[model samples]
Target chain A: VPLYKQIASLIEDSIVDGTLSIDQRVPSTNELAAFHRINPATARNGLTLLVEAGILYKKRGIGMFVSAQAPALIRERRDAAFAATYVAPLIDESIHLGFTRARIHALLDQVAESR
Target chain B: ASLIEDSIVDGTLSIDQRVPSTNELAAFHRINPATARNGLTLLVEAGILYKKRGIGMFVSAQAPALIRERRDAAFAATYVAPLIDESIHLGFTRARIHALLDQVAESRG
Candidate 1:
């Protein structure tokens, strides 16, 4: 995975699996960088992504913390991420193939049924 | 506190501005330089910043703008009525559909 993704996933895993407890201090960028053997900036890149997504928050003089809404935010970000990386492309291909919006949607329905 | 906020608010660093050397930002922040640089990377992908070659980084001429536009369109597609119709036709109920959203959101976070 990309560095940002690696960091993001680590944090997310900690949150979901209870490896990193809520309200706990997340690793500092330096610590993260050292742990992952990446540039410090890259470490922070991961945190910043989470922060922007509402999955993490800064405490000013302190380090980062899991947001009360981190889980929800994580879910939101992930779902949106998947759609952009996957669904949008699928829909776009359908459009390119001359599928009407409705027809494309029907195709999606068929897939859902099988799932 | 002073570092990241200032760089962003003052336009000292733009979304596309090659992020200052991570070491430089780290020293400036008095925290881990890695953390400072990581923050920049986060902004870049979020459409808050951009990168360049030997010249450095830039404030994505459209950094914040791109983020806003992308977000607006994504929200419309995900929550808009037609999207829901498609979801329902695909064997998901309004309640179940939203529940699924909630489920995925829960896992993602």
Candidate 2:
């Protein structure tokens, strides 16, 4: 496996298993590079990939940090599939529950406002 | 593959621009060269790319338009159509799903 993925996987795995808590600081690329015995490029690549996916966020001058707990990561991933996963089911049930799309727009607005 | 798709969709990878070679993709992504080739081949299958037979892969001329067409259909089928069909059944006015979506998202923040 690529070191990038290895870094990504390890960070995520640690967080998911509760070894790392939300917003905790993660290892720096320099530290990772020294430990892994490789250049920092792939380690930097891994960190960036985590940042891109919202699994981790960077704190200016403070270093990289965990963005969320495991479920938040799942939620972030689910956000992309939200329409297909949640919206689709909601609509599917709405058809049976005696509501129309226009009504859903209204209900969703109402629901959203309730949040 | 999805990154390449996003690049085409966002106009970052313009039509007929040469994509990175399989070796480069494998090297950069730390993927097996063979798996990189497979992803590239699938991109070709989607009509998003073309091979110049020993030159390199190039973005298809119709990449942008075709990508939009397929993506539009996918979005519609995935989200829009179901809402519309339900709208038709529920006897309500039709509109975008954005406002409500954003409202929900804002609450999360």
Candidate 3:
């Protein structure tokens, strides 16, 4: 991903994990761009993109902050494909367990027991 | 009821189309008529299907989207609870599991 996207991703990670927190002011363009001194114009686009996504809000003179709804919004997105995203081990272990796709429910059910 | 819901999800059934009659389902599945209606009634009660006078039941216009919405909503909130519990029992962290996903996605993407 681009540096702009990286900034957005890390910011979202911080918000989702409760580090940056709801309504907490994040870095201003000057603060971010000055660190990078890379692309002064597009460097600000990261926060702009987040604002467009409703994950961040701009206060008149307050730079940007996490939205009150940002955490839940970000959560629904990543959770959209839990089976594909979170079932890595189940897939890796399937061959070892003599598992067929059809038997997935059975294996999971048996594993679900006494848990 | 679940079977009808399955039709809506899998596109076996379409909007406003009359679903199978209780007797039709009952005879085909070898289940009692009431047993067949058992599932259909839940769909009607939940507004996934609605009854028309002398015309039998039909799928609601919103049924497919509504079913997907609620199902996917529940999916994230708790559908994976047991899966996580089982995975947790076997030792996994969110980062490591997601890292595995990232690797798979990059290769596949």
Candidate 4:
């Protein structure tokens, strides 16, 4: 179970697909935990993850919301998956494979310019 | 296990890094002292790190490798499924995902 990320993406999908409208009150952490049969802490973690990504904001004593900036943020974040998920691991793997950073950057530049 | 787990996972604490006095971990994460003690005990139990009778815990030399392995093992189940599901839900479909994978592979050459 991609537990945290899965929950995050589910909320994001709901937002994008109109199931969750902008500024709407998101499922409360406990509600989400019950709904998903997850640990309450895990649900809170999911909410915290979205908050970190700026997709949602906590209202303190209230609940979370799809942020006013969420659409643009989501686009930026999705494009950035290439960086966080792909390029980061790629760089790590390159180093693990004994390639120097200089060599990796050189290859990256070469590929970037070629494409 | 909560505080120490967060510390190690969050990089706030490392293996063999002397653990603060029992009171310290409790204050830091705002938990019961017994709970904090329990958390550190877990690290001690794992042999990822240990304590010095009255001194503190330090990150074990093997701690980084242990953390890195756990982190990597966690990524597949944490990351891959959402990527695939999001791709499918966004209409990219499995074929498109495979095509993108091929593109990525070819580009890496």
What's the TM-score of every candidate structure? 0.44, 0.37, 0.41, 0.40
Give the candidate number with the greatest TM-score.
Answer: 1
> Runs in model 4 with CA error above 4 Å?
A83-115, B1-109
Model 3 lDDT per residue over A1-115, tens place = 8888777787788887788976667977778788766565556777788888899887897678888989888876655445454565445544454545445444334334523
Descending-TM-score candidate ranking: 1, 3, 4, 2
Each prediction's DockQ?
0.02, 0.02, 0.02, 0.02
lDDT of 4 by residue, B18-96 (tens): 7567798788778899988777777677766776777777667666666655544444334444445465465555545
lDDT of 1 by residue, A5-81 (tens): 78888889889777776679999999998988899988888999888878888889988999887777776676676
Candidate 2 residue B17 C-alpha distance from true site, Å: 1.5
Question: What C-alpha lDDT, on a 0 to 100 scale, does residue B65 get in candidate 1?
Answer: 60
Candidate 1 residue A48 C-alpha distance from true site, Å:
2.5
RMSD of each: 22.5, 19.2, 17.6, 17.3
The 10-residue segment of model 3 chain B with minimum total lDDT is B100-109
Residue B75, candidate 2: C-alpha displacement in angstroms: 1.5
Candidate ordering by lDDT (highest first) = 2, 3, 4, 1
Error of 3 at A41 (Å): 72
- TM-score for chain B of all predictions: 0.43, 0.64, 0.67, 0.59
Error of 3 at A85 (Å): 14
- Per-residue lDDT for A1-115 in model 4, tens only? 6687788888888877778877689998899999999988888888899999888987787888888778778776785575356544554455455655455444443333432
**Model 2: per-residue lDDT, tens digit, A11-56?**
7777867888776788899988898777799889988888888778
